[PDB]
Amino acid sequence: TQTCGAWEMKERLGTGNVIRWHNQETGEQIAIKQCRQELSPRNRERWCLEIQIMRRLTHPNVVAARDVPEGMQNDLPLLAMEYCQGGDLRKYLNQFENCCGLREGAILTLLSDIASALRYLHENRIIHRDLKPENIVLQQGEQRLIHKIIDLGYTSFVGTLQYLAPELLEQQKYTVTVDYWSFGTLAFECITGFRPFLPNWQPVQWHSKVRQKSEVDIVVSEDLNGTVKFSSSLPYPNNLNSVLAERLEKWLQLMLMWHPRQRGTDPTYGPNGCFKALDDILNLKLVHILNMVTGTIHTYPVTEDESLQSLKARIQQDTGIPEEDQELLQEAGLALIPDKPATQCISLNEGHTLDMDLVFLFDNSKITYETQRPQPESVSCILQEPKRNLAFFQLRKVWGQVWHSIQTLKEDCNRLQQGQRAAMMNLLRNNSCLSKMKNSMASMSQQLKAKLDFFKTSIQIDLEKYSEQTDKLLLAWREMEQAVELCGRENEVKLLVERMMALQTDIVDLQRSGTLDDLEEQARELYRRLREKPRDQRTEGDSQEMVRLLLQAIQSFEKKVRVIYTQLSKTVVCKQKALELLPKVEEVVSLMNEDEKTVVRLQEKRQKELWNLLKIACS
Amino acid sequence: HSWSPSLTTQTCGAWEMKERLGTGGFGNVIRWHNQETGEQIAIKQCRQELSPRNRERWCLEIQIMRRLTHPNVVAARDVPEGMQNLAPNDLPLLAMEYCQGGDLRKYLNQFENCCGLREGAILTLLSDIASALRYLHENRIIHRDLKPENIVLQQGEQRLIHKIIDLGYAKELSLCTSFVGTLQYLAPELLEQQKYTVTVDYWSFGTLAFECITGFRPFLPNWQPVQWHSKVRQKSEVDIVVSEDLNGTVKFSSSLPYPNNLNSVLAERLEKWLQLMLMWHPRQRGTDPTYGPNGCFKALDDILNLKLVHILNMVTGTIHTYPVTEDESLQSLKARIQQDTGIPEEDQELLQEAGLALIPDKPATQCISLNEGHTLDMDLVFLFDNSKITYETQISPRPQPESVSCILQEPKRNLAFFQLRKVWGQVWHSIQTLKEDCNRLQQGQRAAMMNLLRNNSCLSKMKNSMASMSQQLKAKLDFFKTSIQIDLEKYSEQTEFGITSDKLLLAWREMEQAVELCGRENEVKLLVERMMALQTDIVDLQRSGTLDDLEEQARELYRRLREKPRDQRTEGDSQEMVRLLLQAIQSFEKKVRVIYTQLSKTVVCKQKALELLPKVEEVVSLMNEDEKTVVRLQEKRQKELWNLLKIACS
Ligand SMILES: COC(=O)[C@@]1(O)C[C@H]2O[C@]1(C)n1c3ccccc3c3c4c(c5c6ccccc6n2c5c31)C(=O)NC4
């Protein structure tokens, strides 16, 4: 469609226009901003000034300027930039599985990358003014997706106002705190899936309502009825952990602050201390413990110095399980190493979650495990009245939330299976040593039976041929014979082989044996269809089909969870029996070893006593 | 003058009148049920006003019925007291037993019997009806209206018993003249209006028998008499079928048509017996080359008394049927299998359902395990070639009938409803056969798996014995090595002052180097590795649909066609049906590929097992000698030492 030697023109990246160019020879990719339009002298200057700013700036989180390919013939120059393979953040936010916000890993890398870029811009005295998901592009790094800032210019109308700091509608002059507002609204949208303050509301009405919020309010929303509610708390559903939700909630209060001068001011780090505040949150080292007793995830911020014993004492307060009874296991069934620090649980990209470095907690005191999430306000609201007609935009929100609820049921249920598999892995690892010991015991018993048989044969000859050639020796030898009768732990080994054999049966029955996975795929496809519905077909309707799926998923979940706990309590009773048998086997192998030592000595002594007879006779 | 809401049909004491058992006419045979005992009866009544000839004809029937007594002939029962009052005239009623299985026409009409009845059902029919006709003819009675409507099924203690009914056309004998019977089973002679004999009942039995084997009558069904007579007259002595093809050509054949549910031998032997019965010549009909005139019953007796053995060659996927004698040895059968499969006696691995190898010196009849549910699958033996390392994943499915392969080639062809009904039933039957054939192959793979697991069991039992013997030997050797080292040390220590026996020292030193060579620890070690690696492959083998659904789909499609109203019965393609068969053929060969992949995996394991068994046996032997020698050498040394003490004590 257009070429420049090896440089061939590709698809439009967005709208003058931005188009991708690919080098046929090197495989190199570039983005070119072009204007075929005729501009006013001020906007002409504005265009040139941007190319100049870009050429000056150099940062890992700011799109790099590139040379315009030689021979790339309005009169205004082109803006050649690096091509970011990941695409814009709006595209990511629009992925159907991100309707209720992005994953935890994706949020931490966003926050980090955009805070670092904003810091560079502001220190080089560049104020963005139009920061939004459309102005954030993702580049493919070596191990993760890197967020970069674009458009450093120097629904439709209501659309443009969506990330603007309130002062911008009110006055002319502004400060860096305009970019805090934008970063905060943006960040919130990535956590929750929607903007903090009454999205798509008309400016006059928006301004009048949001003005009324308190210093601690980070969300102003309209329910289905349509009550406007203000909140200090980060909304649910979100894919963040307990601690991160709590800590990002308070950081957002700094950023979504109505007061323009007070915005970004940290109580510790003073004005513009919002970047140092986030640094603390991002540098936190978190440990996630799943209490198998209750099924709740406990998150603990740990220090590099913090010992496993300190963490155990902290788990103790939230679970009621004493340090001594705490069995802490990981994915593969290994118990946590006490010499090592609490940070041992920690194993950083967009695919990072709490599930990655998750530890499963079991109570050694428990013999049996009895089975023990609250859906958002809008979901429980539609559960009560599923036949209610909702406008398409309202349908889109509750359906995404219902789908998210089911995904959570599925994910929650799989974490419990992972916990049961960790306990099974530990059991199989113990059963392995138990088998290795059983075989040694079996082998030692057979070797002992053999040596005893041989000694019994040997001594019988020696007793016969002695009496034939006619004291203290005869009585001593007869004691040797009755003494070796008492050793041999055949009957004790017998019983332990029965137990060890009966145990391995229960274990093979445990390892030798969904709809909840299916109900999620059903809900996902139903939500997919709603969002892929043509604009003319977007009308009013019921949530009957969706609410049907959630109820079936709840029912399926509790049924599936019952079975997980039945197998867990079966696994733990096997683990007990195993731990009970190990010393019993060890003890019998010890006894047998002494029996062998005794047979060996008694044989050596008798032989030496016979050569002694031959001495006396040789004189 | 008022309408009653009661629904009691008509009573006679404890006896409640139920439905008519017949199909058309006034309702001559009706079922009666005893409310108190639960007993059921059938009552035949004559027509109200009769001509003196038909009055005489009626009496003659009552007389014949009263005389007759046979397990396969419905006997005359006492008329319940008070019923003769409710009779149309002075003439008696015919009270008979009620046969709960119903008539044979009902069975022939069951949609799953469109291509004939099952092999078990054919053998019990033939046996029961031959015995009844034999009884009649020996007691000089000719039936003259034998057909499926005149055969009823009674519930026996272990099977369904076929019985003969309706002696209303029957004559006591001699030659007869009367134009009596059913057009569809009417012997040529009766249409020629000639004098005739018992051979009229042979024709009826033969046409009937054929219809039960194939699903349709032998000679041009539903053709008008004049046209029928003109065409069927032209058949040869050996022809048992005259039919109309898809292109309407009338074809004559000596052979029994396909599809049928009979085995190879039974089809061949019943084919030639049918030539005797469907013989145009009236005097020659039923004449057997061995048993002479009227020897057709003794001929069938031979066929029925045959003891058959069904062998499934797993290499090809074909079933070989062998008529065996009570004296016939397994070796004779093996020699017979050899000719049809090319597998020598020594390479023949013959297994049954549960994976047990056939016992030589037991007779060939050991393979044989008898009602309507009896099949060749019951007493089936699976043949494997010990020479084979791998089995070919393709085996060629069964050759489908002439009409099926004809419509497979051109499915868009329009056929008349009656032609559609035939090919669709046949296509449905082809799919059922694909399903059945495929399951037999799985059974063969499971028999080989069962044999493997049985062998692996003994192999495990031997491994443990070997392991145990090895540990016991290691122990005794350790002890002997310790013992002899003491004895050698304390001897050399006492040479100068004590006893010097150069002969003893050398003998004892030989004992010591001799026991160094024995102990088979490293040999046992390797066998435990192999035995362990084998058991892995075996657990991987044992720890590892659309063909049945495609059949249900075809069954429903054929069902729909048959239940189609008479006005709606028009022309059509077999596109929907041919689609299903192609899918079934594709599904079958896919399923069969998997069966053979696992079979060749099973047989390689079975080889390794049979390779390991002697190796284990050999090492345990060696170890046993090592033990024997240790025990002896120890005893001898001890006795030699006490001998030194004798010499020193003198
Ligand atoms: C409608 O799209 C937009 O608003 C974008 O800001 C977002 C979108 O196009 C715009 C115009 N955009 C811009 C608007 C203004 C300046 C630069 C860009 C821009 C760039 C890139 C991309 C891009 C790459 C892959 C998918 C989408 C992409 N976009 C851009 C860039 C890029 O890779 N390098 C520069």
Ligand SMILES: COC(=O)[C@@]1(O)C[C@H]2O[C@]1(C)n1c3ccccc3c3c4c(c5c6ccccc6n2c5c31)C(=O)NC4
């Ligand atoms: C055209 O012929 C028929 O329909 C039958 O032969 C076949 C039919 O009714 C008839 C009239 N029939 C007869 C015609 C003539 C004599 C006896 C029967 C007869 C009998 C029975 C039955 C019977 C039982 C169950 C279903 C249908 C049954 N039928 C009969 C009997 C029976 O149980 N005992 C005798």
